[PDB]
């Protein structure tokens, strides 16, 4: 049917403004730099990784929270910490944008996941950081919607991937806000016709961002339920590409990394355990994959700048739409 709230196009100024990137590529570059090390659960440097996350938020004045919890896996007990930024955390309905950050233990060695996702991880705070003022104005509405970033743990198998041995921490949190009970009276300005039984029910719409940074990714719609949010990402990569504000290898050419069309096609991902519960998905994850996927090659060296640089317009231009900021 209808999406339950009506997308306001962006206005061209703030297109353009959006679409404007500096000294921005360099502070991009340097959060990045904080996720381009191995990150294995129960690892040192994953703890230095979340604390890094929960640290750069609190700066930002987002009220974080830490769903902490152990967990058997084919390795044994382990310790899974998702970390969970939400702007106004009193609004009733949230944009969710997400990823994973803990790294695919690779028995062959030592692994980076720089597009999985120490990249989608950087963006995510990276939009927080470079929105920061605006997002703060965005809050003072009391307007009853707010952004909301959840860094999930766990997302990777420690052996052959399964039902139980992938999606810790995204399958514990999904279970924990379910039976989280609230309703419409408990929160700022629920939308109309809304129905809130538990905190599940309070995203609006999750945006998965997995598996960026590699050169030409190419998505699709994978759910029929946000096709209106999806044609948004679409929308405004062509307003983008008309602005001249993307960069390619030679002149009139135009980027194409939102397909406008949908893709029958089964992804496993963090997303999973959500929409079992009837969050509307946005799965921004390529088809293919990289090359370098689950490969010792993910690493630092095989990210494509210019990529990422365009990605970056197009999710900030998407949450100033979204969020009309
Ligand atoms: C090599 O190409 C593929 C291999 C496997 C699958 N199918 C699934 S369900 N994979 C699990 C995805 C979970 N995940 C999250 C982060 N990194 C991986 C699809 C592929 O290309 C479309």
């Known amino acids: 049917l209808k999406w339950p709230r009506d997308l306001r196009p962006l206005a061209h100024h703030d297109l353009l403004y959006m679409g ?3 000294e921005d590529r360099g502070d991009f570059n340097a959060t990045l730099r904080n996720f381009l090390v191995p990150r294995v659960v129960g690892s040192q440097k994953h703890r230095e990784v979340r604390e890094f996350i929960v640290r750069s938020l609190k700066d930002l004045d987002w009220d974080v929270e830490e769903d902490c919890f152990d967990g058997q896996t084919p390795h044994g007990i382990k310790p899974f910490c998702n970390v969970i930024a939400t702007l106004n955390p009193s609004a009733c309905h949230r ?22 996702s120490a990249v989608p991880c950087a ?5 927080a950081r470079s929105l920061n003022g605006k997002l703060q104005n965005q ?8 952004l909301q970033l959840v860094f999930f743990d766990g997302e990777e198998a420690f052996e052959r991937w399964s039902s139980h041995d992938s999606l810790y921490g995204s399958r514990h949190l999904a279970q924990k806000w379910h039976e989280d009970r609230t309703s419409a009276e408990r929160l700022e300005s629920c939308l109309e016709r809304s129905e809130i ?14 598996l960026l940074g590699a050169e030409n990714p190419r998505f699709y719609s994978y759910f029929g339920e946000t096709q209106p949010v999806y044609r948004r990402l679409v929308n405004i990569e062509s307003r983008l590409n008309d602005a001249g504000l993307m960069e390619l290898p030679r002149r009139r050419r135009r980027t194409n990394y939102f397909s406008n069309s949908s893709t029958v096609g089964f ?18 994850i390529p088809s293919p994959f990289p090359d370098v996927w ?11 700048h210019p990529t990422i640089s365009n990605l970056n317009k197009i999710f900030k231009a998407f949450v100033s739409e979204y969020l009309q900021l």
Not at 139 to 146: E, I, P, Q
Not at 269 to 280: A, G, T
Not at 294 to 304: K, S, V, W, Y
């Open 294 to 304: 689950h490969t010792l090659d993910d690493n630092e060296q095989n990210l494509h």
């Open 123 to 127: 963006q995510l705070l990276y939009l």
């Open 267 to 284: 992804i496993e991902d963090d997303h999973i355990p959500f929409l079992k519960r009837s969050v509307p998905i946005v799965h921004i």
């Open 20 to 22: 404007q990137i500096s």
């Open 139 to 146: 809050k003072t509405r009391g307007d009853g919607l707010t």
């Open 95 to 116: 944009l969710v944008l997400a990823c994973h950050y803990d790294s695919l233990l690779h028995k062959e060695g030592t692994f980076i996941g720089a597009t999985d």
């Open 197 to 210: 039984a538990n905190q599940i029910d309070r995203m609006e719409v999750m945006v998965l961002l997995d």
